[PDB]
Design an enzyme around this catalytic site. Structure first.
Site, short mmCIF file in Angstrom:
data_model
loop_
_atom_site.label_atom_id
_atom_site.label_comp_id
_atom_site.label_asym_id
_atom_site.label_seq_id
_atom_site.Cartn_x
_atom_site.Cartn_y
_atom_site.Cartn_z
N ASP A 67 -59.92 -73.06 1.97
CA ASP A 67 -59.95 -73.82 3.20
C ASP A 67 -61.32 -74.51 3.30
O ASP A 67 -62.29 -73.94 3.79
CB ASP A 67 -59.73 -72.88 4.39
N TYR B 298 -60.62 -66.67 9.29
CA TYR B 298 -60.47 -67.24 10.63
C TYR B 298 -59.63 -66.26 11.45
O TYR B 298 -58.54 -65.88 11.04
CB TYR B 298 -59.77 -68.59 10.53
N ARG C 30 -38.48 -85.96 10.93
CA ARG C 30 -39.01 -84.65 10.57
C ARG C 30 -39.28 -84.55 9.07
O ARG C 30 -39.88 -83.58 8.61
CB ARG C 30 -38.01 -83.55 10.97
C1 LIG Z 1 -31.31 -82.95 16.67
C2 LIG Z 1 -30.99 -81.54 17.01
C3 LIG Z 1 -31.94 -80.39 16.71
C4 LIG Z 1 -33.24 -80.69 15.95
O1 LIG Z 1 -34.26 -81.25 16.76
P1 LIG Z 1 -35.51 -82.00 16.02
O2 LIG Z 1 -36.14 -82.75 17.12
O3 LIG Z 1 -34.87 -82.91 14.97
O4 LIG Z 1 -36.32 -81.02 15.31
C5 LIG Z 1 -31.61 -79.11 17.08
N1 LIG Z 1 -30.40 -78.87 17.70
C6 LIG Z 1 -29.44 -79.85 18.01
C7 LIG Z 1 -28.16 -79.31 18.62
C8 LIG Z 1 -29.75 -81.23 17.66
O5 LIG Z 1 -28.79 -82.07 18.05
C1 LIG Z 2 -60.72 -75.00 13.29
C2 LIG Z 2 -60.38 -74.23 12.09
C3 LIG Z 2 -58.96 -73.82 11.77
C4 LIG Z 2 -57.84 -74.19 12.78
O1 LIG Z 2 -57.43 -75.55 12.72
P1 LIG Z 2 -56.57 -76.18 13.94
O2 LIG Z 2 -56.56 -77.63 13.73
O3 LIG Z 2 -57.34 -75.79 15.21
O4 LIG Z 2 -55.30 -75.50 13.91
C5 LIG Z 2 -58.67 -73.08 10.64
N1 LIG Z 2 -59.71 -72.71 9.82
C6 LIG Z 2 -61.07 -73.03 10.02
C7 LIG Z 2 -62.03 -72.43 9.01
C8 LIG Z 2 -61.39 -73.83 11.21
O5 LIG Z 2 -62.70 -74.09 11.30
#
Ligand SMILES: *Cc1c(COP(=O)(O)O)cnc(C)c1O
Ligand SMILES: *Cc1c(COP(=O)(O)O)cnc(C)c1O
Ligand SMILES: *Cc1c(COP(=O)(O)O)cnc(C)c1O
Ligand SMILES: *Cc1c(COP(=O)(O)O)cnc(C)c1O
Lengths: 398, 398, 398, 398
Positions: free
Chosen positions: B189, B116, B63
């Site tokens: 953006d 957007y 992460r």
């Molecule tokens: C590892 C863990 C998370 C976090 O999950 P991710 O996949 O790392 O985001 C949340 N809760 C518990 C209890 C965990 O063991």
């Molecule tokens: C498509 C688009 C987004 C959204 O992006 P995602 O990858 O779909 O989340 C945001 N802003 C503009 C201007 C876009 O064209």
């Protein structure tokens, strides 16, 4: 034939061929799904029999086909205007299975002196085990071909065009005429050309094969073989393929399908950068000779204009020096990778003498055109100005 | 800073930036390896402490980072000339985590009426829960912007440029000057622009974000978000990112890295087909109006000309008809897919009214420029001829 | 040998072998990276020569090796206690390249009458072109093997054990002794056994080959071949492999590496279910005969007992009926898929008569043990009860 | 309710749920296809409207769904006997989006002192911005839960069970009863348990969430979040999900789907190996204390036994020493990787004090049970004897 009546350009075809109008694996997705399965199931014994009696369709087993792969088969078949195409694990896999399936035991084969090394080896060490004997001629020497067609009973004439590394070209149309006259088959390896710079099938060749590892995939990240042509012929190879099983993984088929969505944009850019760089080099003090079907110097440059629309992205030239000096040059470059292969977005350089004939003696190497001088440049898709600057800066250190 | 001194063109950079000179994940391979791991190990507790005391480097947990993903981070940072870049699960993920991290509770935000939709919704329903009040001006109205900057204590000005679907443009340099004068932050953006058609960072914007799902990836087969800028700022978002965890999968990071090896070739093409087709349509007796910064009829074709080099691959136009007639037109096309998104090799068409505002009443839709007439066309990479023919053939059925 | 001194069980080896102690492709990641490259580069011509003179290591080209694939090679080599292992595109690819590389032209081969059909075909239609001739004996008939090992000079004895579909077993140790006495080579296809239920190499066989498409991968989502043995031998095949190029894609190599992390857990469960259900069926009235090395009725149950710690997950039995009745049974099952292949988490059923000999006449089929009665069941990893219930419920409809 | 009437065991369900009876993405393949697309197309505006008027089904955009992902959604829903399941980019993504979607501004939340750190931080630094106040009680202290449930208005009670790293358990049934009495919602994080060792939904919890990055995927090669429950509730989160867009990549969804084909086989071994080694550890003269719900010394072993069929594969214990000595122990181990995460085939060790609280002062660390002594062991799937030998050998160096 052709795919779509509303798609008249190779670029539009390379993109939508085999997908736009339907896939077989139904979806409302834009792209082709990667199907990771080793076997396909049947709903009831009844349907299994139907399929067995050609009343139903199925790949049955993974070694016999796959949904995410036929797409790539139909896509290439469109570009080449072929009746059917067969995809394999690699280029060498395609050449090899084809030779074993089409040339009978004892039969005769005919190829040039510029034949891909590995393939030459296979033709001179394995094939003989079956009585298969050959005749190695010059790419240009059509007289040789003509004669061999009469004394021995040629089964198939196999040659690449352009050729590696000197890019020699063959008159597909003329050569095709002679062979078919004496019943021989003609197979052209258009790896360097690409189904965009020439249509070997249109010019008369019976089979055209590629090494999708190069230009087709175009991203130096996957190996694959190619063989397109008429059903009657390509299906005979497809059979021996189901036994030797050099199948292509769906994940590979997709990386290529994806890579072909920009085949045209890529090839176009390489063609320029290539030609343009050719001239610059050929006119350089430190460059002795330059091989490129585009140049006027090229022996069959007359054939190149008459049968090709582009001259490729590969350019071979000899630096004004020796193994060591030439080496100093390639070591001086900063953008290309010193490595084998070609045809991808990244530029690559290599000294065929060191990279593929180092196992031979200087005398044996020169025994077939390879010199410590010879450099093979595969032009990437980087900016022409960036590249050129680099090549010149390097030639200065020499 | 520049990646390489021998790489002076965005095309060469989009290709080798973050790879050519080294990767961090050492290899003699040409491409970046996809590292599928959820955790990174340490050799001995000793080294784990070093790392914890900033004496060693490690991603530690998935992460928090990944080898095959930083490459893409460094690659984009190069194109934008940014100090650092953060990649996310999607565009909406990038916009959202950024707003939540940079705008304080109670703080004020300023954006255009062309913001957007989804993002507008997030700004009008979620952000208010944290006391964040906002001001919505016209993309062009620089006066309003100047007043808001004066009445309220604006925290950040967020806007896309070009805008969707009318492609309105903002003078990044001017707008940036006003904001910074009053301490506001500027985030642009550039999704429709691309880091090739403009350098939001160079023009003064503090942060430039993209939705790599569109042009960067360019193959309609992967979603991703983008946020480049100075370390001091982008790292503040990176932190909240490690808690909200909308991480990007290595396989996605690679499909984009690969997609960017032809960004230049693709955008270049898309830039033509667009501008040219924009002109044909403008001169058509069945097209009521045409939006494109490249045209002269555009309100800010003067600002677009000075701060941008290309004009994008998206073109919006109004057919001469109604919901039903316009529909008959798009239903007539044969190459593009009727679907959302844009920026890929396959062409796509959609009626913003039906595809994204059907939930509103005709009066509420028109309440913000969206008409049953409006058509949004994302020009693929197919041949211009094939494309032009198709669009005309379709306009005839109307 | 042993990978690690702290890893004494096949389960712990299948997991960490080729990774725990180091990979070659350095990482702090827990898993092996997928390296999607078609070529490997060199830093300077100097290093390229080193490598060429065996002073440096490199795969050079993709057809010759890959980082994410050697791991899987070293991992299997550990399980089999082999000196070296070679991975290919598929099982048939492994068998085929090996036969072509080890058996000389004009030579002689010896195999059982239960040899895998496809392979029998290759041995009876392709190999003869090379002047190679074969001797087909009964799996059990050791006297024959002895006679054949004399009258004519045998080059290699090739057989699978267990066999398909009757699971006949061969005394690897005894058979190995006789052959080596007369200089013949012994190659055992442990596909059905698995490197966990037996060690063909330990029992004396020179080479042991598998079809990783089945148990090794175990998820019915990838094809692959296997050949382990001594360097001196396996390297001879590896060579012909670099010419025929039926390389394995890195993505496939990973799917298998991943699948082997639970090889032991899977084979164990498949082993129990197979056996127990084997018993249940044998006593069931509607069941005529049952083939399984575990049962006391198996012709070579003693050899099975003697050289196997497990009896596999495949069970063949004959229903009390005909083509149609037997069919009604398999059509009645609800959990397994009617399809080819075996060894994966999903259970599979098939009637060898319809699925692989339908092309032959009832008389020609029976000409080699295949009856319309014979059913081949590949037990999945589903719960034993869920499966037992299903098989019984189906046998009732008969 | 259930998936199939012929599938009565969680093992058979984990395998075929969401696939055996149909997929939505029609195929004759055994496995689920990976659909790499960012958008879904419509045949004609007509059908687009249908879908918009809920007369047709479609994912429309990738941020809103995917074929290869719903399978995994329906698969997990089956195991948990949930009405619907939502998959995200990671565990933290699932926890976070859920809290933001279900707890109103100004609302009140209640959780234990053993709440996952990252999540605690999110609850104590972000949530307050919207006035969401929280009450932290002891996992065991039910009196406190009854008081807080009576002083302030509780919106939702969130807790994991088992807990990290001390594996404290909560009486889901009792706690669920109290909350619902006062209208509060109950969400249980069964990450350590697995949908196999307990059914939080069955015991009364409204929502059960997991971090598929651990046990579900089980191969330490992918991150993912999980949230199952009733449509009415899970769909409210799914909405905010479509705006925050922390979508899951199809390639990830597949790695998990695949990983779950042996969920049962893996959890079994981890369940045993864990429990057994816990005893051996507690009986060791060098282990000061041992935390495991399966032990009789565990404060809630009576609740565990009552609402759990297994006790997990994680075991936490305190070595008889200090930061340095304890370290010397983990450094002595040879099979596990010193790294974060848990639940996969490879064993992993870590010192919560150094790995996740090194940022705090010794006094602040101990301020919440974390000691330099505490070791957290995630038992892999390697052989029990290989694992036991290694742990003992290491405890000897202490
Ligand atoms: C590892 C863990 C998370 C976090 O999950 P991710 O996949 O790392 O985001 C949340 N809760 C518990 C209890 C965990 O063991
Ligand atoms: C498509 C688009 C987004 C959204 O992006 P995602 O990858 O779909 O989340 C945001 N802003 C503009 C201007 C876009 O064209
Ligand atoms: C590269 C190449 C081949 C070999 O193809 P692989 O994909 O490496 O097997 C064959 N012929 C030519 C002319 C080539 O350039
Ligand atoms: C399946 C099988 C093979 C063929 O392997 P592929 O992976 O399909 O090429 C060869 N031998 C036996 C004994 C098999 O069971």
């Amino acid at each position: 034939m052709k795919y779509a009546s509303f798609l008249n350009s190779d670029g539009s075809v390379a993109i939508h061929a085999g997908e736009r109008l339907g896939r077989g694996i139904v979806t409302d997705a834009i792209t082709t799904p990667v199907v990771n399965t080793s076997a396909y199931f049947f709903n009831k014994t009844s349907e299994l029999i139907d399929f067995k009696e050609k009343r139903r369709a199925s790949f049955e087993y993974g070694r016999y086909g796959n949904p995410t792969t036929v797409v790539l088969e139909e896509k290439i078949s469109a570009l080449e205007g072929a009746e059917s195409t067969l995809l394999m694990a690699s280029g060498m896999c395609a050449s090899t299975v084809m030779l074993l399936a089409l040339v009978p035991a004892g039969g005769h084969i005919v190829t040039t002196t510029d034949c891909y090394r590995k393939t030459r080896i296979f033709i001179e060490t394995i094939l003989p085990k079956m009585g298969i004997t050959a005749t190695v001629i010059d790419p240009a020497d059509v007289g040789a071909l003509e004669l061999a067609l009469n004394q021995k009973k040629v089964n198939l004439f196999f040659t690449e065009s352009p050729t590696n590394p000197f890019l020699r070209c063959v008159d597909i149309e003329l050569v095709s005429k002679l062979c078919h006259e004496k019943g021989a088959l003609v197979c052209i390896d258009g790896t360097f050309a690409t189904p965009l710079n020439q249509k070997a099938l249109a010019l008369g060749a019976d089979l055209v094969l590629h090494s999708a590892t190069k230009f087709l995939g175009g991203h130096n990240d996957v190996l694959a073989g190619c063989i397109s042509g008429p059903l009657k012929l390509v299906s005979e190879i497809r059979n021996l393929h189901h036994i030797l099983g050099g199948a292509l993984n769906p994940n590979a088929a997709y990386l290529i399908i994806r890579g072909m969505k920009t085949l045209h944009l890529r090839v176009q850019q390489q063609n320029s950068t290539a030609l343009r760089m050719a001239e610059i080099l050929e006119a350089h003090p430190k460059v002795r000779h330059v091989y490129y079907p585009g140049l006027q110097s090229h022996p069959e440059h007359h054939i190149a204009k008459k049968q090709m629309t582009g001259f490729g992205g590969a350019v071979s030239f000899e630096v004004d020096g020796d193994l060591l000096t030439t080496a100093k040059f390639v070591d001086a470059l900063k953008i290309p990778y010193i490595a084998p292969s070609f045809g991808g977005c990244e530029s690559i350089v290599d000294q065929p003498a060191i990279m593929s004939y180092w196992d031979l003696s200087q005398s044996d190497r020169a025994k077939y055109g390879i010199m410590d001088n010879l450099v093979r440049f595969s032009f990437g898709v980087e900016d022409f100005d960036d590249l050129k600057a680099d090549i010149l800066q390097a030639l200065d250190s020499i």
